[PDB]
């Protein structure tokens with residue numbers, strides 16, 4: 001499809017390549033102090049979230065149909081899927097067999113260097129990464145899946161039908177791809193790990209909560225809004 | 234002083250169950266099985282919190298001077314210390330060598346009957362309990378310590394100087410007692426006061442737990458607990 005192709009093109013451009021990969025800050029051993037954290041750690045965690053939202057936003061803008069949705073709805077979909085997309089993209093691009101977190105900017109960091117800012121949450125993501133990797137999801141299948149996480153019903157959409165339309169479009173594109181390379185199943189197996197993912201988002205909210213409590217540095221505003229809008233109260 | 238100390242001790246003892254009005258009817262140390270957390274666990278956790286609330290208020294009312302602070306400041310101090318006090322009184326009352334949580338009603342429960350509702354937080358409390366017990370804090374020393382958790386600076390007080398005054402009064406009372414029983418005139422005291430910052434950290438774990446449960450939203454919190462959660466979030 002030209003669609004599939006546009007999805008893959010959007011996806012690949014939204015992450016880095018082996019070249020663009022940044023070992024400038026990477027250290028294979030750091031001796032941190034567990035269960036505590038300073039302002040640098042907290043800022044870097046927030047900055048990694050921020051930059052991921054910026055990248056995810058540009059990625060979404062290249063999904064055909066997405067940019068013509070209402071602004072409100074664009075924001076709503078992005079904000080509602082952000083954490084879920086952050087984790088999924090992180091898990092898919094990282095290298096858990098080496099303890100390597102690879103973020104969308106190309107920044108590579110070791111699990112121990114992420115321990116301070118992220119807490120447990122980073123270990124939990126790596127476990128998810130390993131589990132997502134054992135499914136062997138190829139790039140076009142993934143390029144579709146990720147878009148379907150974004151383009152989905154959310155409460156408060158102004159034009160849910162347009163969203164549902166686009167959702168169907170992308171579903172068909174995926175279905176078609178997984179038929180073409182076969183020559184319902186992997187999918188049921190994929191959906192099997194969604195609870196891991198729902199839990200992982202939850203861990204993210206808890207970690208933001210905790211850091212907000214700590215208040216060493218204030219969250220960026222859009223991250224802060226997402227945190228708050230996600231809360232049912 | 235003096236008689237202050239005596240009023241503190243009297244308030245403290247009257248605010249908890251007698252060794253003989255203790256309730257083991259619900260105690261079971263063997264809990265088969267997990268996994269996750271059902272709704273009966275969440276309600277019991279909220280109910281246990283609730284039950285300490287009214288008791289801590291009557292306890293505070295018997296601290297000399299406390300009723301002579303502004304009503305607004307009274308509410309603020311209670312709400313801001315509820316969690317810390319709940320934990321401190323629990324940690325002191327309970328028996329961590331045996332896994333026994335003893336609540337202010339007299340209800341005795343095993344750490345595994347509290348795990349589902351409280352999560353990690355109960356282990357953290359028990360660790361604190363064990364550590365508070367190694368200090369061998371006698372009842373008057375404790376009767377003072379608890380009051381000092383309540384009577385302390387908080388943001389929004391109308392008369393912080395008066396709160397400070399009463400705080401100092403109680404501090405002196407404590408200092409004096411710990412000198413009169415340890416060897417005059419500190420280590421033990423600086424070790425006692427060491428527990429207050431730990432207690433804040435445990436309050437934090439409580440908020441995190443309430444957050445998480447509010448997120449899960451099996452059962453909603455009681456409004457007054459909910460209000461305390463919300464008022465004591467700086468946002």
Ligand SMILES: CCCCCCCCC(=O)c1c(O)cc(O)cc1CC(=O)OCCCCC
Pocket residue numbers: 076078079080081082083084154155156201202225226227229230231232448
């Ligand atoms: C785990 C609790 C989720 C239930 C919360 C209900 C609201 C969900 C929602 O639609 C919503 C929104 O309308 C705007 C937002 O900015 C955020 C959300 C929350 C949402 O997308 O679910 C969890 C992940 C949030 C960050 C990607």
